């Protein structure tokens, strides 16, 4: 009986707002006289966000990841028969990564045959960008000896900054999880360990969920406890997958949709 239901609950919703806030206007008036009474409300009554309700070595550093000892050379390739947007994407990685060589990948040389070349030529990391259609979709960082390999998914790219030739400073956020700090480990390794302070360029890698956002900014310091920053470089969202452990042979995590069911965890 929709016609009955419609009036009953509209009036009840109307009744509730009056009662909800008349309680609150009396709350306001008792708070004017006593500040202490407000304090106790904030203790008991909690906002209860998702972050609040989350459902809960040195040899490695060098052996699996690149350190501040050499310049790391990154073998930037593309998936076979890719179009304009992939190379347009390669031009954004040509700036941000330290010593990139772009390799036009011409059919064959399966994967191990590539590894033979980048042992001889002596590269450190391989990065490969792929396209299903006209948009870029996946990004794969591999380390050339041993093979800790990370796969990623891009769902955001939007393009007023125009940066200098100065090398940007790193910053990472929320990697409490050990699987998080092994990805934090990758971006500590793969991006430059130079930071030239002047030039004022900052690269972030914020991870408040399982989604990682990387951005560039320009920071201006005023002595009144505050800093300003303008949007620069590519907009970006990544998703971790796989951790193939060998060059491509093994797995450690491999995202399924069996997660998202928890609404929490966050790896």
């Amino acid at each position: 009986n929709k016609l009955k239901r419609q009036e009953i609950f509209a009036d009840i919703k109307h009744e509730k707002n009056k009662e909800r806030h008349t309680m609150r206007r009396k709350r306001a008036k008792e708070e004017r006289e006593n500040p202490e009474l407000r304090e106790q409300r904030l203790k008991e009554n909690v906002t209860q966000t998702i972050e609040n309700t989350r459902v809960y070595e040195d040899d490695l550093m060098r052996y699996f990841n690149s350190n501040s000892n050499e310049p790391p050379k990154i073998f930037l390739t593309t998936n076979v028969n890719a179009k304009k947007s992939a190379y347009e994407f390669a031009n954004i990685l040509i700036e941000i990564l330290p010593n990139v060589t772009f390799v036009k990948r011409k059919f064959g040389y399966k994967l191990k045959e590539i590894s033979d070349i980048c042992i001889k030529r002596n590269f450190t990391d391989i990065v490969i960008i792929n396209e299903d259609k006209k948009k870029v979709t996946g990004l794969t960082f591999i380390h050339l000896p041993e093979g800790p390999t990370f796969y990623f998914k891009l769902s955001s790219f939007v393009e007023h900054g125009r940066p200098t030739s100065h090398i940007p400073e790193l910053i990472l956020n929320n990697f409490q999880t050990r699987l998080g700090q092994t990805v934090g480990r990758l971006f500590q390794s793969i991006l430059p360990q130079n930071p030239d302070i002047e030039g004022r360029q900052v690269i972030t890698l914020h991870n408040q969920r399982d989604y990682i956002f990387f951005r560039r900014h320009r920071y201006v310091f005023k002595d009144n406890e505050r800093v300003g920053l303008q949007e620069l470089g590519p907009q970006f969202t990544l998703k971790l997958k796989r951790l193939q452990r060998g060059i491509k042979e093994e797995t450690e995590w491999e995202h399924k949709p069996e997660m998202d069911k928890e609404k929490k965890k966050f790896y």
Binding site: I50, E51, G108, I171, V202, Q208, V227, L229
Partner: protein
């Protein structure tokens, strides 16, 4: 007989026809030579009928005799066709002695195509492909859209950088 079988399936239903938008008719009776269906090119209407098929890599040539109209259990008599192309076409020819020139070159033609279907091995030896087709289920398409939009809102990236620049350059003064 067989003329009465044909007319009753030409119109009045051959219940395994595909009407293509081209107006073309395709019999999917696994034992026909031409994938298309026409009179004595489909294996039900005709009584003498030859075909090449494959069950494994072994390419047999099946053969249907009007002798066996009584018994459908053992209709298709079958013979293995070596593996080398030249001796196989010669193998074909002897079986087709004193038949229609239709089945003569058409089983020769079936054998030709089905042997160049064994370009599958070519695709599967030089496979090693780093792609593989992934489905995009529309539930996942929103678990990875509406949660990113909820991520950015709770992220507050500006405030995060504003904290970890002041907290850096106070300690690195």
């Amino acid at each position: 007989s067989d003329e009465i079988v044909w007319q009753v399936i030409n119109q009045s239903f051959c219940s395994h026809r595909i009407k293509a938008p081209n107006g073309q008719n395709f019999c999917r009776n696994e034992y026909n030579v031409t994938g298309l269906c026409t009179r004595q090119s489909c294996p039900l209407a005709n009584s003498k009928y030859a075909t090449v098929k494959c069950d494994n890599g072994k390419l047999y040539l099946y053969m249907k005799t009007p002798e066996r109209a009584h018994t459908p259990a053992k209709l298709w008599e079958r013979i293995k066709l070596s593996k080398n192309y030249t001796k196989a076409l010669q193998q074909i020819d002897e079986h087709l002695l004193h038949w229609s020139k239709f089945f003569r070159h058409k089983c020769k033609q079936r054998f030709t195509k089905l042997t160049q279907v064994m370009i599958t091995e070519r695709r599967l030896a030089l496979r090693e492909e780093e792609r593989h087709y992934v489905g995009v289920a529309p539930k996942v398409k929103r678990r990875e859209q509406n949660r990113e939009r909820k991520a950015l809102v709770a992220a507050k990236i500006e405030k995060a950088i504003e904290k970890e620049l002041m907290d850096r350059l106070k300690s690195g003064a």
